[PDB]
Amino acid sequence: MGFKVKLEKRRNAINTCLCIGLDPDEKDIENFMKNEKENNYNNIKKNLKEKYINNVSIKKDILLKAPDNIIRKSEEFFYFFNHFCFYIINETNKYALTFKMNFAFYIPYGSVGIDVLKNVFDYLYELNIPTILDMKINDIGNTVKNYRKFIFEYLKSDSCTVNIYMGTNMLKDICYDEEKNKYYSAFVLVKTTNPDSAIFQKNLSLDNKQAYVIMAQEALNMSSYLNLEQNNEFIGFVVGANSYDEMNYIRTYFPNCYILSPGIGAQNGDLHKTLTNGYHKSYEKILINIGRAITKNPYPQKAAQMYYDQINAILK
Amino acid sequence: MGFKVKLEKRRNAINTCLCIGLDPDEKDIENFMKNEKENNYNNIKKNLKEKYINNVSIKKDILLKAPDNEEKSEEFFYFFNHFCFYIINETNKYALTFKMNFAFYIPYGSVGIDVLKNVFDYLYELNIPTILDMKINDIGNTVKNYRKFIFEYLKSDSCTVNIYMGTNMLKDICYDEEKNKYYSAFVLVKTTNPDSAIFQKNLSLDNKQAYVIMAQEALNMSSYLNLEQNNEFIGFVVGANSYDEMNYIRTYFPNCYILSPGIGAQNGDLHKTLTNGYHKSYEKILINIGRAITKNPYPQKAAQMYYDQINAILK
Numbered sequence: 001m002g003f004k005v006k007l008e009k010r011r012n013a014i015n016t017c018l019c020i021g022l023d024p025d026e027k028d029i030e031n032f033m034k035n036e037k038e039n040n041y042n043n044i045k046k047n048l049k050e051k052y053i054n055n056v057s058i059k060k061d062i063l064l065k066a067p068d069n070i071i072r073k074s075e076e077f078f079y080f081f082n083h084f085c086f087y088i089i090n091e092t093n094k095y096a097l098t099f100k101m102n103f104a105f106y107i108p109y110g111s112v113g114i115d116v117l118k119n120v121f122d123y124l125y126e127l128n129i130p131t132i133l134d135m136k137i138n139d140i141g142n143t144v145k146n147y148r149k150f151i152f153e154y155l156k157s158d159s160c161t162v163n164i165y166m167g168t169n170m171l172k173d174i175c176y177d178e179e180k181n182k183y184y185s186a187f188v189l190v191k192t193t194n195p196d197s198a199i200f201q202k203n204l205s206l207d208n209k210q211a212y213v214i215m216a217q218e219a220l221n222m223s224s225y226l227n228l229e230q231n232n233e234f235i236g237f238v239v240g241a242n243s244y245d246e247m248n249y250i251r252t253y254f255p256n257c258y259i260l261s262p263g264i265g266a267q268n269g270d271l272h273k274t275l276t277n278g279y280h281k282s283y284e285k286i287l288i289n290i291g292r293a294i295t296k297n298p299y300p301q302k303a304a305q306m307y308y309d310q311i312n313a314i315l316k
Numbered sequence: 317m318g319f320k321v322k323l324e325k326r327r328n329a330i331n332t333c334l335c336i337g338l339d340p341d342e343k344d345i346e347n348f349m350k351n352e353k354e355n356n357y358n359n360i361k362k363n364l365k366e367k368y369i370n371n372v373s374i375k376k377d378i379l380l381k382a383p384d385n386e387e388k389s390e391e392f393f394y395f396f397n398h399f400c401f402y403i404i405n406e407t408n409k410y411a412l413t414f415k416m417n418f419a420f421y422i423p424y425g426s427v428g429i430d431v432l433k434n435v436f437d438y439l440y441e442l443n444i445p446t447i448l449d450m451k452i453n454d455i456g457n458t459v460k461n462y463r464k465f466i467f468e469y470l471k472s473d474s475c476t477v478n479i480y481m482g483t484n485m486l487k488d489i490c491y492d493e494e495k496n497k498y499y500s501a502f503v504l505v506k507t508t509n510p511d512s513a514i515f516q517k518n519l520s521l522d523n524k525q526a527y528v529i530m531a532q533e534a535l536n537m538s539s540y541l542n543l544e545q546n547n548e549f550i551g552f553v554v555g556a557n558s559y560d561e562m563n564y565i566r567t568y569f570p571n572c573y574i575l576s577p578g579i580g581a582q583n584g585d586l587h588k589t590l591t592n593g594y595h596k597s598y599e600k601i602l603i604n605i606g607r608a609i610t611k612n613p614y615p616q617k618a619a620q621m622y623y624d625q626i627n628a629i630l631k
């Protein structure tokens with residue numbers, strides 16, 4: 001029951017390859033607190049009723065207290081940050097094949113944000129939903145082990161994004177752990193959504209080949225080593241939604257490779273043929289990430305539904 | 317006072333370009349809390365006597381309790397924090413800057429980030445140049461919060477960046493429009509892992525190796541954000557083993573700030589042919605020494621050892 005397995009059954013369960021993004025910023029938080037207050041803590045009282053919130057590991061005592069009597073403190077931010085996350089998850093989780101949290105949004109406040117991240121992952125883990133920590137990690141072997149522990153041991157995440165520009169061997173200490181054997185899954189950065197994400201990814205080359213291809217190439221040869229596949233794990237690729245051209249090629253010369261693709265909502269895309277279409281397969285190997293487009297929309301569940309039906313409205 | 321004048325005056329005040337790296341691991345934190353236990357402390361007790369211990373801002377309650385814990389819960393936080401203080405006090409006298417690699421402070425969860433905050437806070441008081449090896453990278457909108465974490469929360473003087481996703485990334489890291497503030501950074505040019513050539517060397521444009529193009533873009537961005545004119549900068553990270561490359565970059569980018577790790581622990585001390593192959597008005601050629609000083613039974617000794625070798629060479 002490695003990641004590969006866990007993905008497959010969630011796919012049948014909901015028939016969709018939608019990856020909901022959970023990158024809450026200071027605005028979402030302070031805003032969530034505002035309206036929630038002038039609505040008599042609607043969504044939060046609704047949170048407190050959900051099942052798994054009872055199995056939280058960090059400051060459950062506080063998270064479970066009634067709203068108002070939290071103005072009776074320095075724990076306030078923590079309270080609303082966490083509840084906002086539980087809220088979006090509760091409101092959209094049934095439409096998502098997986099969930100991807102970007103590490104960067106949980107560290108700008110120090111400790112407090114990691115406690116939230118930790119609970120967030122303990123929540124999805126109980127909900128038994130596939131997770132992806134978008135932490136685009138990278139460093140030397142020795143150091144990398146630390147990212148591996150945090151991600152796969154502490155947060156019990158199912159996968160994480162990785163940047164191998166520094167070298168492919170680094171994966172040896174990210175997707176594998178000798179001491180316990182254990183094999184983990186990761187997504188390498190191939191084609192990113194940065195407007196200028198071509199200066200190095202397209203403009204750089206080797207044997208007429210564009211860097212992103214050599215990079216995808218290597219990433220795989222490393223997967224063969226470690227025999228992740230044999231252990232139901234894999235090393236997929238992050239392919240920007242607006243890289244139609246490049247998207248189709250990866251899918252072709254890498255038939256059964258797992259692809260993660262962000263960029264349609266808040267970065268202007270074309271769902272139809274911005275993935276899914278370009279880069280089809282028994283999907284799930286083509287994850288469509290949408291975050292801000294959903295997390296900032298005033299009717300999250302609605303927005304979610306919308307993209308769900310929409311994405312699914314593509315049976316070819 | 318910008319990171320260039322700060323880095324410049326300290327360099328003159330202790331004449332050295334050594335950069336002690338503080339990357340404590342789970343073992344170092346075990347060997348430490350095992351010696352203070354079989355030795356009535358003394359190192360922790362010394363830390364508690366220090367002048368700037370009360371400038372730390374997180375969990376000072378427990379951080380200041382003479383040992384003997386009771387709160388077994390915060391036993392790990394306690395010792396982890398004091399090990400860091402231990403080394404800092406033990407070795408700042410020979411340091412031009414300190415480099416803390418984020419990787420080592422996140423594996424236990426928030427507990428470690430509390431310790432990172434205290435470390436940077438503590439160092440801020442000693443007014444010692446700081447670096448956060450986080451090699452951050454993502455899109456403009458995300459990276460923004462890395463900036464808030466590194467430069468507002470920790471108040472670090474600089475951090476490391478993996479530009480591969482796009483140089484533009486640097487506009488939302490090295491510069492905050494809403495505060496008209498600037499910050500310095502070190503960009504991954506030539507790393508020290510064995511298979512570092514596959515991409516940094518074997519990739520190119522018109523026969524220019526990637527690290528060369530990365531170096532360039534990194535620099536073209538510095539001028540566009542006018543960092544140099546605001547006492548900040550964008551330098552390059554160049555592994556101590558990259559002898560050739562080290563010379564090329566120093567030559568075609570003569571006044572650039574260079575950060576080079578790799579001597580000592582890994583690949584074994586290059587042999588300061590590295591500091592020579594990259595000389596300048598030292599501070600531009602920062603030499604990082606981590607485990608060779610942290611893993612050593614005599615940190616202060618290990619420290620002035622490297623300080624002295626370097627001292628000589630710069631002649």
Ligand SMILES: O=c1ccn([C@@H]2O[C@H](COP(=O)(O)O)[C@@H](O)[C@H]2O)c(=O)[nH]1
Nearest residue numbers: 021023102192193262265266290291292
């Ligand atoms: O090339 C990439 C790789 C990853 N992401 C991630 O996608 C998430 C945003 O999704 P959205 O809010 O734009 O829909 C961000 O957290 C970011 O880290 C990108 O936007 N572009």
Ligand SMILES: O=c1ccn([C@@H]2O[C@H](COP(=O)(O)O)[C@@H](O)[C@H]2O)c(=O)[nH]1
Nearest residue numbers: 339417449507508577581582605606607
């Ligand atoms: O290419 C690089 C980039 C960074 N580091 C940093 O060097 C530190 C280790 O120094 P040392 O303990 O090996 O002396 C690590 O934290 C790592 O982040 C390298 O070794 N090589």
